[PDB]
């Protein structure tokens, strides 16, 4: 994190140790359920490269998720690199070099520049955009975990309703396509999975029901 | 939350590690039982939307109720969008744009923006008006999950007045109704569905008895 | 709490979540002894009527004490607004509302106005007031939940004068009366109540003795 | 404690609810050994009255102490009352009260005026004052929790001579008389209440030797 | 860690205790695990070589590696020693001394004098010297402990790919070379070691595909 | 630890009490295993000699090795006293009296006379000849309670090198002389106190290994 000095001279605060702790408490009990990218966009706030680094690399469990967020950081450097080219030229007037791809992360670049990058004005905020790529590849990794496709899901014989509306509900939270297919997965299939009576009276309310009269008109009915 | 910079540039802290855990494990052990609003209520005081959305989101639990508090806070910012309309022209001379009912939350708001809207002179509190919508979904929440209606408790035979007191007005808490009628429930049913020997005795003090009177009158009577 | 901004404007500091969960342990694990006053008294130091709701609120295990301590207080209002009346006019130049009874408390009053209420000179103390009677109405709390009145306590057979002096004054701190009488209990009832051996070595010592002279003359003695 | 304010009013920080936490625990845990009163001497340090009282208030455990060293303390001001006598007149220009027997504790003083009295040249330190009596009364209590007299250790037929040393050294540190007196029970009854091998190999060093030589000189003998 | 004095004076903070504990903690728990050195590489930053002296010398446990790390140190000392020769002079004016390969270590330099080392202009960074060397030597700690040599790993007959991913890139990890042969091991010994059947849907994707395909192609399949 | 006031008092804060936990609980779970040394070493930075007896007091374990450090607290007061004598004269224009040895220990030193003794130019830094002799002290105990001479630890027929490098190297840690003698020890005992095979092998490397050779040569050979 940016902190400015007493004089004031841009400097860097170490993380805390506590952080790191809870990052790897939260990365070790929770597996990869979808409340780590929540969860690592908040330990990492205004965090340097070199921070988010610290905590890529303080995990000590599940390597191969690990060594995928690596290739698909590596993937979005190599995309970023493209896009914006060099400049081809010496050093301007008082300017500071521009960010390459591995600059943006931790391995090319030195924590003065990257407390200079984000620090000058305009500012080019290299963290904000190391955290993007990092939740992006956390993404597929969340993904992959999940041990069930939407379209697999019915809830049992004798199943409250809650129980069933909380495991669609997670797997449609895991399984991220898009914000339509979201919606068409809520309207069509959580009242088309249900149990025969459960199915009964969900028909018998009708469409364009919010989630709280469905959970209310299934309350008991079906134990 | 909002704090002033040395110089002065009205700049953010990242919300503590200790408070989503403590909010975490809040919601993990306690449920949804009354006391999660005004806990919320208190981890909260003064924190941005961005804050907000993340307290909602780092949990992984019961994904029913964070979806029908979803669908509560975007009815209420559709009930936004109306009251207020749209300024309908170009930029005013020295002025932000208008808290859309998106823009209250986090979803069409970067925290730049909502840093300015809360420090500015009038103040807009978009933190203050996320925080009453979250509220008012957390009520029905709370409602939901409580697995018994106020005229459905009655003192067993062998019970001590102390716990059908402290049920009783558990259950009064989790149903909120209106003020008069919870006024009414205290004064009619509390002494019309208990132990017959208590039916007794509370008919012998008579009404207009303050609930302290009512504990002392029972102490060890009914054992 | 009141904590002052570097600009100065009169500004309020949130309690921090560990205050509200060692008083939320606090109550929970320690039912409603004597010791729950001065922890009370202790981690609401300057607090705002707002922070005292908060604690108050937080609490979600014995509801019946917290209706009755809410009875107590909305009676400690009644009383308060008999004693001081309505001004009955218009604003006196640069001045504010003289609080209510309601007012005092968190119901019809916003945290601005109770921070000027309180910073103001000469001040109006409206958290003390409050803190007075909540203190006055958590007495009753712990006055109900001994289970044995101060004249029913007697040393065992074959027990130790220490463990039924920790018990008599235990029992004393809890029956608060008044002090005079509370001197005649302990200069009266810690002889007369004890077994017959410590009766007759009691009665050798004679009157006008300190509790550490009664202390040491039975160590060992009794057993 | 006192902490100066950035104007500059000479105010009182709250003693924070880890501290309060601590000592409790250290009462309940350790039961009244010796250790307790560095721990006191160090938890309080430039406390208040006040805040010397909250943490005698805290505990709820061995009431029967509590009322002893609450004995011992009124006792100590009852002669603190005779050594200082009454001013016996008007208020001085610009001058603050003399404290009292009672003023010197929280009873009969207010939380400014206690911090008046510890601010002002020359400081009057009634803090000091009142941990002094404190720690009085808190020697006499550790005495009594004592379960041995120290002219009754002895040490058994097979039992290594360190943990002699460890049970004869603390009964020494619980029974506090005098100085020279305490050499002189080190350097006679150490030896001469130890195994008769011990006592026999201790007779063959002889006097005046440092108690590492004594352990030296015993390691291993006597198994 | 270093930080400015009000006044400045350029002064040294003590590493917090609950740094220490951490640090501890973690190479107690984790033996010498490739985690360790993210740790130590986070828990230091900016401290002083004392700083990491006492980091070094808290723990108490496998000392067989912190012997083989403190030669280590000697030896990149005296490989130190070769490179910068003495200065062989007086003092310049208003110069302090060019520093020793002891002298970037804590033995033979004052906390003062690394205090000097660190602030002035030019920085001779002591720390970071003193940090690279420690990192050096933990590698060679990391890679003595690791249980098997990386061409020994093969998934054993019912297996999840999973569980082989993890285990082969953990061992890659522990066995560090150099890039380019990692990259060579990673492209075909995780393929050419599994289940025949794994080895036959592996074959049939093909070269040049990421690990992420590698996951999902077997996924569930080989059960 | 000293703290400049805002004003500018220098002023002394009181100990953390995390802190003083801390050593308790080390000192209890670790008996007094070397590590002690360097964890007082670092948990009392800059601490004056008040803090310093404050930490020691705080122990309630073993009181013999309290007592003995005591006796040799007293004996290094005593051999200062010799060393620097007493000026034998009035007070100098401006200037505190010279530290005795009772003084540089917290017997004859109020805190005020301890606050100016080390922050006056030229500086008398009371707080670390009390550390050194301190420490001076801990070294004896540590050495008396370890249950082991350096050379009577030999290797077991079915034990690996490894466990027997951290025996030796720990008992070589605990069994302090001087560096030559430590050298010497390592060097010729380490090799000739091995497994007849281990004997053998450690034979065929040859003198002139680093500990390096001898731990990755024996890896396995042995078992």
Do not use: C
């Given at each position: 994190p940016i902190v400015q000095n007493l004089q004031g001279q841009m400097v860097h605060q170490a993380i805390s140790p506590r952080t790191l702790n809870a990052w790897v408490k939260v990365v070790e009990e929770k597996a990869f359920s979808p409340?780590?990218?929540?969860?690592?966009?908040?330990?990492?706030?205004?965090?340097?490269?070199?921070?988010?680094?610290?905590?890529?690399?303080?995990?000590?469990?599940?390597?191969?998720?690990?060594?995928?967020?690596?290739?698909?950081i590596?993937?979005?450097?190599?995309?970023?690199?493209?896009?914006?080219?060099?400049?081809?030229?010496?050093?301007?007037?008082?300017?500071?070099?521009?960010?390459?791809?591995?600059?943006?992360?931790?391995?090319?670049?030195?924590?003065?520049?990257?407390?200079?990058?984000?620090?000058?004005?305009?500012?080019?905020?290299?963290?904000?955009?190391?955290?993007?790529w990092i939740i992006l590849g956390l993404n597929k990794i969340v993904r992959m975990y999940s041990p069930t496709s939407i379209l697999d899901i019915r809830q049992g014989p004798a199943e409250p309703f809650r129980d069933y509306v909380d495991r669609f509900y997670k797997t449609l939270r895991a399984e991220q396509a898009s914000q339509e297919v979201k919606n068409w997965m809520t309207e069509t299939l959580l009242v088309q999975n249900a149990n025969p009576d459960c199915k009964t009276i969900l028909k018998a309310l009708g469409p364009g029901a919010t989630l709280e009269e469905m959970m209310t008109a299934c309350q008991g009915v079906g134990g």
């Open positions: 409340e780590v990218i929540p969860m690592f966009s908040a330990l990492s706030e205004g965090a340097t490269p070199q921070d988010l680094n610290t905590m890529l690399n303080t995990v000590g469990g599940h390597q191969a998720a690990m060594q995928m967020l690596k290739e698909t590596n993937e979005e450097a190599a995309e970023w690199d493209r896009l914006h080219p060099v400049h081809a030229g010496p050093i301007a007037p008082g300017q500071m070099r521009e960010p390459r791809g591995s600059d943006i992360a931790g391995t090319t670049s030195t924590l003065q520049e990257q407390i200079g990058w984000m620090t000058h004005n305009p500012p080019i905020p290299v963290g904000e955009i190391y955290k993007r």
